[PDB]
């Protein structure tokens, strides 16, 4: 099942001497205090400034032994989104009263989400899928 | 400790202290069997 879901507005797309990766600076359209910093493979999923991205954090896809390449007739949560990444949560930081910022790593491709209400759902799990639409 | 003869022949004291000495050249250090020498070449596959 899902742990986080929101639509973000892109404010920056920086390569930073990288030919395939970009550091995305985003802000939530629903929540005011919510902020995002995420590294994406721009070669596969290109992101432009002033774009609407539906970023979603899930635990799995609706006990698995190992990952297998796609084979005819396989259904996944990934079929609804365009770009999907698998990573782990490594740091839980608290910024002033009520605000909490989580740190994720999708194999070097880092993410930093800042919020407040997600303290219950978002937990340091060695398995967290990140799915993006549009 | 002997009179000058018109380099003299070395005595037994001289034999034990020829250069570094019998103790240094043939006891503390020795030429060995089952050993080889060669120029080293680099290898990242070993």
């Amino acid at each position: 099942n899902t742990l986080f879901d929101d639509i973000f507005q892109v404010s920056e797309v920086d390569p930073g001497r990288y030919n395939k990766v970009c550091r995305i600076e985003a802000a939530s359209t629903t929540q005011d205090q919510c902020k995002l910093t995420l590294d994406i493979n721009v070669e596969l999923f290109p992101v432009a400034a002033q774009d609407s991205l539906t970023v979603t954090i899930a635990s799995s896809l609706n006990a698995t032994r190992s990952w297998r390449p796609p084979q005819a007739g396989d259904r996944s949560l990934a079929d609804d989104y365009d770009y999907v990444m698998y990573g782990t949560a490594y740091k839980f930081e608290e910024v002033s009263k009520d605000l909490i910022a989580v740190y994720y790593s999708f194999g070097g491709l880092l993410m930093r989400l800042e919020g407040n209400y997600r303290n219950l759902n978002n937990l340091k799990q060695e398995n967290a899928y990140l799915l993006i639409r549009r | 400790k002997a009179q000058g003869r018109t380099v003299p022949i070395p005595g037994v004291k001289q034999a034990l202290e020829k250069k570094e000495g019998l103790f240094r050249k043939h006891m503390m250090g020795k030429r060995v069997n089952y050993a080889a020498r060669s120029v080293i070449s680099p290898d990242p596959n070993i």
């Binding site: 297998r68 390449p69 084979q71 | 596959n45 070993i46």
Partner: protein, 103 residues
């Protein structure tokens, strides 16, 4: 007639009990067959893991590891790989002969 046993050998020190996974050692071979064979073995939907490794350039050896999922042994995956590479070469040889005439 006598079949040579030195060419292909199964490294039992690495072979799985099933055996779904095995390491094969081929003499007088390198990247030429190696990279071409692992490419074809990897197209098999049952092959989980496959790669090739040359232990050292001075020694004439080629190692190819085939890890599969169930219902297929590593030996079968290798036999399919060789059978498909032969057919692949026939396709290349057929298309080249046709284009020579097409000129």
């Amino acid at each position: 007639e006598e079949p040579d046993r030195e060419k292909i050998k199964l490294l039992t020190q690495a072979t799985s009990e099933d055996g779904t996974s095995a390491s094969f050692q081929i003499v007088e071979e390198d990247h030429t067959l190696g990279n071409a064979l692992r490419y074809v073995i990897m197209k098999n939907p049952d092959v989980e893991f496959c790669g090739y490794s040359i232990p050292h350039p001075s020694e004439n050896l080629l190692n190819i590891r085939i890890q599969t999922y169930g219902e297929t042994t590593a030996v079968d995956a290798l036999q399919k790989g060789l059978k498909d590479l032969m057919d692949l070469c026939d396709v290349v040889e057929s298309k080249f002969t046709e284009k020579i005439k097409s000129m």
